[PDB]
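Appendix B. Worked example

We walk through a single record from start to finish. Start with the input: the chain for Outer surface protein A, Borrelia burgdorferi, length 250.
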Amino acid sequence: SHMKNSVSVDLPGSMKVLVSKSSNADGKYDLIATVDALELSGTSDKNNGSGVLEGVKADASKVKLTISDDLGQTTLEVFKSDGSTLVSKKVTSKDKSSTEEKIIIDGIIIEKIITRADGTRLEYTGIKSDGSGKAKEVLKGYVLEGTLTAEKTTLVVKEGTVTLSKNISKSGEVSVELNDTDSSAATKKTAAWNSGTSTLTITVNSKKTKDLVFTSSNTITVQQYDSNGTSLEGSAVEITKLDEIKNALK
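Next comes the structure step. The output line below is what the pipeline stores for this chain.
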């Protein structure tokens, strides 16, 4: 889009809007944006890019973009040609820590993508009316997979008899658990999670064997204990692939 005597205003996600530099005789600002090759326009009593823009598709469907007063959220709605029956709604919200994109069909959030400031992502797909769905965490070097419920996200790595589960609460808090079906005292893995240090300490045969640290950078490091299980030795090593998580679980 183009507008004479205008300013381009960045919006959450891929979008931008143009706002007039000055208001008209009635004090209203003009707004224009292109979304998916369709030009939308509107007017607003705000000077910053916020307000409502509309357009009409060739097939007669109405498109409406609503930009929140603080420019932190957009809602992109497609309606039937009546202009009021929803077909789809996409809400994108941005702040300093993340951008979240939600797709809502029939009042149900069916997809949610969170892109963190560091570029890693949580991708929730196939979400059902009960809040359950598929989850993927796209990290630096590898992807964890699992499931979503209305309670929490659980990403899972399985290695033989061992299952490592990384849970993410609704507030974004990470906790990790481990279960091993092995019933032998000499070889069964057990673990203790310390929420205060974001560290999972694995024990085998009554000795601590390694710490897995789940860092603020959304990475995992592994470090071994000495052969007595007393103190950490060597250096913590960043995990770069799923096979390295699994190696730690053998």
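Two observations about the output. Residues 105-250 form a domain with the Outer Surface Protein A; domain 3 fold (CATH 3.90.930.1). The helical segments are 242-249.
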